[PDB]
Design a protein around this ligand. Structure first.
Ligand SMILES: O=C(O)CCC(=O)C(=O)O
Ligand SMILES: O=C(O)CCC(=O)C(=O)O
Ligand code: NI
Ligand code: NI
Ligand code: NI
Ligand code: NI
Lengths: 379, 379
C-alpha cells in the first residue's frame, strides 16, 4: 500500500502521499499549508533511494549547477525512468507541467538562503538527512520566485529533519530554507514541482480573447474605434478606464450565459511540452472503439492556419527535452466532426456508426485517422 | 486653402477633407456614414494627378497585383514622396498605421466584386473617372474583410462618379463596388486606409494583462490555482464561467479607481511599423529644451529584458518597408526618471534643472541621451 501504484494517474498520486487521503489533501493542504509526511518504511526508503543517487551524477558527468556548496541537477526525468514514470502520471493527474530538480549538499553545509518558490512542490528525501525550516509566506501563493531577508521571514512555523522515505509538500509562496546536518552523510532530495503560472489570472488572460471576439461580434460598441492618438499619450484618461470598466462588465454578464471558453495558449503549451507516456485490430465501421491515452490528448477550435477542430497529443513528445525549454503533433478536422469527437471523448465505448457524422466513409475515415495517431482502441 | 498644408499633422487633415470642417467630420461622419466631397478645383485636380500616374507603374516595373482586369499597386508611399509626406502626417494625426493601395482599371471594365473592407478609407481620384455604388453595411464597423452576394447587399444607398480632385470617405463595413465607365480614359485612384484592428476590443485585450497582473498582486483569489485537468476538458463548466465573471467584475471595479493602463503590444507595434518623418546647439543643464518629433515618440514601463521606462521612436524607420510587413530603436531608463520624462512631455518648454531628478549629472546625462536620438531641441 505504501509502494507506488502506477495503474492509473489517480492511483499513483494516492500512493505518493500515502497514508494521507487525497480528499484530505485537497481539502486542507493543497494551496493552503505545508504537509509533512514522516514515514517508517524501509522498503519505501530503499525505493526512494533508487530514484537518484550521488553516483547517478558521475554516470551523467545546463545539466547540473553549483550554488555556494549545493549541487543542483536539472530535470533528472530525462534519464531516470522511474521519475519519468512518476512525473508523467503526475502531469496527467494535475493537468499541468511537472518538472523536477535534484539537490545534493555535503554534510554540515548550509544550502540556498531563505526564499520562496513560484510552484507547488513535492519533496522526496532520497539519501541522507536535511534540516528544514518553513516560515509564514510574505506573499501567499506567490507568482514569482524570490529570496527574503532573515529580518523579514520571522520565526519558523515548522521545523523538521527529513530522511529517506519522507515526503514534504508546501504551496508556492511558502518561505523555506534547509541545511545538511554536520556529520558524514550528505543530503540528496528531488523537488517535484508543478502548477507554475496555472492560476485563474492566467486562465482569465488565456481565454479573454475568445470572449471579447465572440462578444464583439454582437456588440458594435466593442467594434468601435479608439480615440485619436490614444497610443501616443503618456497617461491614461478617466474616460478610457470608465469605458473599459463597462466593457469588462458586459463581458462578465455575457459569460454567465456562456458555456464555451477558448484557450489561446494554455492547452497548446501544456501538450506541446509535457512528457510522453512511459514506454520503457484495425477498426471498421461495425467496430466498438474508445479513446486511449486520453490524459495525453487535448482539443480546441482554431483558425485553419476556416475554424477547424484541432487534436493535439503528446504521444510523440521528447522526454530528453522535457522542461529544458530549448525549442505540433496531432490532427486537423472540420467543425462538422466536433460533436462526433465529443461523443468519442465522453463515451467509455461507442460504435463507429453511432458517430454523428454525415456519411459512412468519413464515419470510418475519422476513426481511422485517430487510430494511426495511436488515440483509438478497439474492444 | 484647398491645397494641402503640411505645417502640422492637424493642419494637413484639415486640408485633405476641405472644405468639410474636422469638427463636422468626427461628429457626423467618422465611423458612422460615408462622406462624398465632390470638388471643382483644377489645381487640386492636377495635384491629385501627380500623386500617382499610370506611367509611375512602368518606372517601377508583391509590388503590383492583377484582379480579373484591375491592377493594384501596393504601398506606393515607398516610392512616392508626396504620399509618404501625406500618410506620415496622417499617422501622427490618427495614431494608427496608415497604408495605401493604388487601383488602376481600364475603360469600360468592372472592378472587384461587391465587398466591404476592415479599415477606414480615404479615396482620392487621381486619373479618369470611376462609377461608385455604396450599400448599407451588413456588418457595421466590421473587423474582417469580406465579399458579399449581390442578393444580399440590397440596393445602393449612394451612387456617384468620382473624378480627379474628388475625395471619398467611408467607415469599415461599408459595402461597395466600382467600375470604370465605358470610354477611352482609365481610372486611377489611391485608397488611404487606417484604423485597422484599432477598436476598443483590441485595446481591452492590449491592456487586460497589466490590469490582471496589478490586481492579482493584491487579490489572492486571482493567484489561486485552477481545478485539476481543467485544460484536459472538452467543455467548459458553469463554475469556471461563473468564477471568471466575478473576476471580470472585480477588475472592472478596480479600474474605476485606476489611472494607469499598460500597452502590451499596441504602442510598440505602431511605432515599430509606422513611417519615418518626411525628410526629403548642444544642451547644458542651464539650457531650455523641448521634445521634437513628439508625434513619433512613445513611452511605457516594461521589464528590463527591473521595470524600466522605455522610449521608442520611429525616426529611424524604413519607408521602403512600410506596411510590407516582411520583418527596436529607442532608449532605456530607470523608473526614477519617469516623472522627469513626463515633465518633458507635457511641458512646451523646460529647463534641465527643473527635471525632477536626483543629481545634476543624470539631469544632464538624460537630456543628452534624448538629444542624440534627435528627440530634444534647444531654444
Ligand atoms: O536543498 C536546499 O538547499 C533547498 C532546495 C529548495 O529550495 C527547494 O527544494 O525548493
Ligand atoms: O477600384 C475598385 O475596383 C475598388 C477598389 C476598392 O475596393 C477600395 O478602394 O476599397
Ligand atoms: Ni526552494
Ligand atoms: Ni541545521
Ligand atoms: Ni475595397
Ligand atoms: Ni458603371
Amino acid at each position: 500500500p505504501s509502494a507506488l501504484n502506477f495503474d492509473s494517474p489517480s492511483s499513483l498520486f494516492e500512493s505518493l502521499i500515502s497514508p494521507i487521503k487525497t480528499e484530505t489533501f485537497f481539502k486542507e493542504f493543497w494551496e493552503q499549508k505545508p504537509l509533512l509526511i514522516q514515514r517508517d518504511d524501509p522498503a519505501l526508503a530503499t525505493y526512494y533511494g533508487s530514484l537518484f543517487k550521488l553516483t547517478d551524477l558521475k554516470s551523467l558527468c545546463r545539466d547540473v549547477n553549483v550554488c555556494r556548496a549545493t549541487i543542483q541537477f536539472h530535470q533528472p526525468q530525462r534519464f531516470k525512468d522511474e521519475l519519468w514514470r512518476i512525473q508523467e502520471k503526475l502531469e496527467c493527474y494535475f493537468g499541468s507541467l511537472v518538472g523536477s530538480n535534484v539537490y545534493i549538499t555535503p554534510a554540515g553545509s548550509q544550502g540556498l538562503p531563505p526564499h520562496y518558490d513560484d510552484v507547488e512542490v513535492f519533496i522526496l528525501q532520497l539519501e541522507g538527512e536535511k534540516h528544514w525550516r518553513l516560515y509564514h509566506p510574505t506573499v501567499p501563493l506567490a507568482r514569482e520566485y524570490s529570496v527574503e531577508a532573515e529580518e523579514r521571514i520571522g520565526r519558523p512555523v515548522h521545523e523538521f529533519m527529513l530522511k529517506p522515505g519522507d515526503l514534504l509538500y508546501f504551496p508556492r509562496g511558502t518561505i523555506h530554507q534547509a541545511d545538511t546536518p554536520a556529520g558524514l552523510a550528505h543530503s540528496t532530495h528531488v523537488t517535484i514541482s508543478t502548477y507554475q503560472n496555472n492560476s485563474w489570472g492566467d486562465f482569465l488572460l488565456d481565454t479573454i480573447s475568445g470572449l471579447v471576439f465572440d462578444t464583439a461580434k454582437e456588440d458594435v460598441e466593442l467594434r468601435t474605434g479608439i480615440p485619436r492618438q490614444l497610443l501616443l499619450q503618456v497617461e491614461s484618461t478617466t474616460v478610457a478606464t470608465r469605458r473599459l470598466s463597462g466593457f469588462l462588465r458586459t463581458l462578465a454578464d455575457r459569460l454567465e450565459g456562456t458555456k464555451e471558453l477558448l484557450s489561446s495558449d494554455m492547452k497548446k503549451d501544456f501538450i506541446m511540452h509535457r512528457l510522453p507516456p512511459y514506454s520503457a485490430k484495425l477498426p471498421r465501421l461495425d467496430s466498438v472503439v474508445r479513446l486511449q491515452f486520453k490524459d495525453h490528448i487535448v482539443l480546441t477550435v482554431l483558425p485553419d492556419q476556416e475554424k477547424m477542430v484541432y487534436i493535439y497529443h503528446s504521444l510523440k513528445n521528447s522526454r530528453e527535452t522535457h522542461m529544458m525549454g530549448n525549442e505540433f503533433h496531432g490532427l486537423r478536422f472540420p467543425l462538422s466532426h466536433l460533436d462526433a469527437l465529443k461523443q468519442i471523448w465522453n463515451s467509455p465505448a461507442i460504435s463507429v456508426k453511432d458517430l454523428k457524422l454525415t456519411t459512412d466513409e468519413e464515419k470510418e475515415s475519422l476513426v481511422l485517422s485517430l487510430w494511426t495517431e495511436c488515440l483509438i482502441q478497439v474492444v
